[PDB]
């Protein structure tokens, strides 16, 4: 039947970049059409494969991905690019053979009043793994022995963005979902079109 | 700590299958890429068998395409290769690896089980 | 496929000198490479991945290099518990294709 990508982008609320969520779409008949020709996507830089390849492999299984991050971040977001969204929040791995696809949500997903509703990790010790979602909330300390809220050198390890909707354009609220192909030599579930 | 267990020996016959199995515990296994690898004596070690365990995906080597079939329960966790049509040339130890990186991506092997020896005659 | 072909395939060097453990492939790969520690008896270990990163538990003695056709994995003081057989593996990219080498057994000079 028709590939249940609609859902993906036309959603309530997406998660947050610490939390972020993940789907399973698997045994699908996909079409990559509704992505090319609309253009309200801001950066689709695709990587690993082209778009017009997408249309023709007969890939395994698909994951899909959704989080907010914060207007300027989406270049963090890249197979190579490091930064505070990159490195405990959500890692790419270089040979990414994918699709980010994100798009403005400053009228959807803000609040003149106040948008503190999404949070991002800042405090972790080392760095994380590509596709890794660490979803805690345990005080950080640069040694061992977990501290309390109130301490001299302990601080929370998650902050909120704070999205506003008289800023520029750099500090607004976009929705980034990147799709993951996962292209194993098994039964094709999910191929294109005709 | 992550921990692969494996079954202990089993010797065969020269054309008969085995079914050796990996069973797994420590993490979560339901985004982890597995794989099987087997090592002849003072040989090396030469096929990937990825094993996608999520709901069917597998991939296997060239030289062992129509031989090995693997399989995944995500209710025992625990993985299965079963390969048939065993010659004089497959009496090797099997190990399986898991994966450093998640299921979408793919990398070096991580945690490594213990080792299966399988020979084949009377 | 591409081989990886490890040249001396026998290192006698004594303990507490510097390894010189190579590891090269046919065509130019990119940086994906993994090298790995079997001891006799015992499973593989992880030692380094993506050839410049260093793997958990592993100390700070290993330290590996290279870049397109020419990697290196350089012990910096042997230990005794540090004489095994080293592996290099290298993974391709679209037929999810993995390759071993040969392995570089390394021994007690007396």
């Known amino acids: 039947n028709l590939c249940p990508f609609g859902e993906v982008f036309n959603a309530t609320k997406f998660p947050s970049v610490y939390a972020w969520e993940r789907k399973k779409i698997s045994n699908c008949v996909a079409d990559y059409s509704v992505l090319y020709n609309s253009t309200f996507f801001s950066t689709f830089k695709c990587y690993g494969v082209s778009a017009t390849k997408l249309n023709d492999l007969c890939f395994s299984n698909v994951y899909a991905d959704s989080f907010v991050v914060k207007g300027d971040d989406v270049r963090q977001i890249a197979p190579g690019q490091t930064g505070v969204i990159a490195d405990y929040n959500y890692k790419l791995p270089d040979d990414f053979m994918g699709c980010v696809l994100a798009w403005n949500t400053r009228n959807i997903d803000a609040t003149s009043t106040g948008n503190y509703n999404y949070k991002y990790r800042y405090l972790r010790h080392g760095k994380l793994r590509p596709f890794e979602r660490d979803i805690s909330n345990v005080p950080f300390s640069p040694d061992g022995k977990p501290c309390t809220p109130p301490a001299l050198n302990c601080y929370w390890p998650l902050n909120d963005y704070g999205f506003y909707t008289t800023t520029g354009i750099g500090y607004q609220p976009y929705r980034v979902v990147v799709l993951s192909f996962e292209l194993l030599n098994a039964p094709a579930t999910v191929c294109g079109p005709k | 700590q992550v921990q692969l267990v494996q079954s202990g020996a089993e010797v065969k016959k020269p054309g008969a299958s085995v079914k050796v199995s990996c069973k797994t515990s420590?993490?979560?296994?339901?985004?982890?890429?597995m794989y099987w690898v087997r090592q002849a004596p003072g040989q090396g070690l030469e096929w990937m068998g990825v094993i996608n365990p999520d709901a069917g995906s597998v991939t296997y080597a060239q030289k062992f395409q129509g031989r090995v079939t693997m399989t995944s329960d995500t209710s025992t966790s625990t993985v299965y290769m079963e390969l048939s049509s065993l010659r004089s040339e497959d009496t090797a130890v099997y190990y399986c690896?898991?994966?450093?990186?998640?299921?979408?991506?793919?990398?070096?092997?991580?945690?490594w089980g213990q080792g299966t020896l399988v020979t084949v005659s009377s | 496929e591409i081989v990886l072909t490890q040249s001396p395939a026998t290192l006698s060097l004594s303990p507490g000198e510097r390894a010189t453990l190579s590891c090269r492939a046919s065509?130019?790969?990119?940086?994906?490479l993994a090298w790995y520690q079997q001891k006799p008896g015992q499973a593989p270990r992880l030692l380094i991945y993506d050839a410049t990163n260093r793997a958990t538990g592993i100390p700070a003695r290993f330290s590996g290099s290279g870049s397109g056709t020419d990697f290196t994995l350089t012990i910096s003081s042997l230990e005794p518990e540090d004489f095994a057989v080293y592996y290099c593996?290298?993974?391709?990219?679209?037929?999810?294709?993995?390759?071993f080498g040969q392995g570089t057994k390394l021994e007690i000079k007396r």
């Open positions: 420590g993490y979560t296994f339901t985004d982890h890429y």
């Open positions: 065509q130019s790969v990119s940086s994906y």
């Open positions: 593996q290298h993974r391709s990219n679209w037929p999810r294709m993995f390759t």
């Open positions: 690896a898991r994966d450093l990186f998640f299921i979408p991506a793919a990398n070096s092997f991580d945690y």
